[PDB]
Write a protein that binds this ligand. Structure first.
Ligand SMILES: [Ca+2]
Ligand code: NI
Length: 472
């Protein structure tokens, strides 16, 4: 079997007309030389540009800029010179920030943002703000974002949120685009370069995440739960790479029913696996006017579903009055929950991954529920470490240690909502004897690691100091 082919114009069509072309410093008064905020300048430039029926280009010239919460607009095409450094402007209000928002609070049509030459840098290393994404996308169509390195500091926040937004009683999200030639350094395990929530006809290409997951197809979030709208469809990716992370490519549908995805050329070095699949699952949320306790919400649920059909309900945020519970993964329970609440576990349609190469290493991101898969090849749990509380205060959520497999697949969960990640020409390099090529639901495991008394990771290892950057 052969992969499906395509051309860049299938996703993104560049402008044929242009009314204006400006320079961020010369025309708008950005200062590339001090540490002042350049947000106003950038936005004034963007605004002036979208004013014109055919828009135009704005050049961001060499220098160091500070931007935050900028609002993109239709028919603006930003070009960024290769010695630019972009930094998040400081904001101490403790909320979730992004450098750039595309179709989040408006509607955006023909838009691009491109590094020239060898690419530029977004730098988070000196930021005091932990809550940062580079781009958040909503209602945007026909776009290209392209060319740069993100120097992260394990912030909370996939860097690029291919996300939904809410306008006039429905959800909206991005249709045709390309996101390509981006490297991320020093990402947090539970995050990475791309996270997708709602997406039609998007090409993801030449993307690399150091840590976490490069292409996270984990389709979750409030608005989609509530509106029963969103998810991803007809996604193409090529050249997805992981280093010192969980996975290059990950499928995790949650509650959303997703479309088709095709991936070619997946590589990883020193990651959990090159490809990862999770089963879908259902959470039932208690009503927002009823006052509930954990035990009362479990009871409402076991009442309609059965003894044993609810998992341990957790708290909705702070408050303590609103509750959510996972339906147990048993066809029976899942069946009644379908009949009774009209909702089921999520899945993906046709999924094909071509050319997967996983190179063994010693510094993968590892989840605690994966450690027992070392039983066959690493029966003394060598080279696995626990991060200190200063490094990560919820000890046991993340470990650093040897690669486990080419492909991890937890999808066999359930009967009716199972989905099929087809993989082709899968290779491993330098895995030890008795190790796993695929890990699934049936794979034999057995505790060999000290979960909470094993030795702790050096600062050097946690902070990836051995990696001297050369994007310079
Ligand atoms: Ca400045
Ligand atoms: Ni760097």
């Amino acid at each position: 079997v052969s992969p499906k082919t395509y051309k860049d114009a299938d996703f993104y069509v560049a402008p044929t007309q242009q009314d204006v072309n400006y320079d961020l410093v010369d025309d708008f008064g950005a200062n590339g030389n001090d540490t002042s905020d350049d947000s106003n300048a950038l936005q004034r430039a963007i605004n002036a540009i979208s004013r014109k029926p055919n828009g135009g280009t704005l050049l961001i010239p060499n220098g160091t800029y500070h931007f935050l919460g900028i609002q993109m607009k239709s028919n603006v095409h930003i070009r960024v010179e290769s010695d630019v450094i972009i930094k998040p402007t400081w904001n101490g209000d403790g909320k979730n920030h992004r450098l750039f928002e595309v179709g989040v609070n408006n509607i955006v049509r023909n838009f691009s943002f491109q590094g020239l030459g060898n690419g530029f840098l977004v730098d988070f290393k000196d930021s005091r703000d932990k809550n940062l994404a580079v781009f958040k996308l909503g209602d945007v169509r026909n776009y290209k974002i392209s060319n740069f390195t993100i120097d992260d500091n394990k912030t909370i926040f996939a860097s690029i949120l291919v996300d939904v937004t809410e306008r006039n009683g429905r959800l909206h999200w991005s249709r045709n685009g390309i996101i390509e030639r981006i490297k991320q350094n020093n990402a947090l395990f539970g995050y990475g370069l791309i996270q997708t929530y709602g997406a039609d006809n998007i090409l993801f290409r030449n993307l690399h995440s150091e840590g976490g997951i490069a292409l996270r197809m984990e389709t979750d979030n409030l608005l989609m739960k509530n509106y029963k709208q969103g998810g991803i469809r007809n996604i193409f990716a090529d050249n997805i790479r992981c280093s010192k992370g969980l996975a290059a490519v990950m499928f995790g549908p949650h509650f959303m029913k997703n479309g088709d995805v095709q991936v070619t050329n997946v590589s990883s070095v020193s990651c959990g696996s090159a490809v990862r699949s999770d089963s879908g699952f259902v959470e039932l949320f208690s009503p927002t006017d009823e006052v509930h306790t954990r035990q009362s919400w479990k009871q409402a649920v076991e009442s309609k579903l059965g003894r044993g059909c609810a998992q341990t309900p957790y708290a909705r945020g702070n408050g303590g009055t609103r509750w959510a519970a996972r339906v147990t993964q048993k066809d029976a329970c899942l069946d009644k929950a379908k009949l009774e609440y009209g909702i089921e576990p999520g899945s993906f349609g046709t999924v094909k991954v071509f050319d997967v190469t996983a190179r063994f290493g010693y510094n993968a991101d590892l989840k605690q529920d994966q450690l027992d898969y070392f039983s066959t090849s690493n029966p003394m749990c060598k080279r696995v470490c626990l991060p200190t509380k200063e490094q990560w205060s919820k000890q046991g959520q993340i470990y650093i240690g040897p690669s486990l497999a080419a492909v991890i697949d937890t999808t066999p969960e359930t009967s009716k909502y199972d989905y099929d990640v087809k993989t082709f020409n899968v290779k491993r390099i330098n895995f030890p004897v008795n190790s796993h090529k695929t890990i699934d639901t049936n794979t034999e495991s057995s505790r060999v690691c000290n979960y909470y008394g094993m030795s702790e990771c050096s600062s050097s290892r946690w902070e990836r100091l051995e990696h001297h950057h050369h994007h310079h």
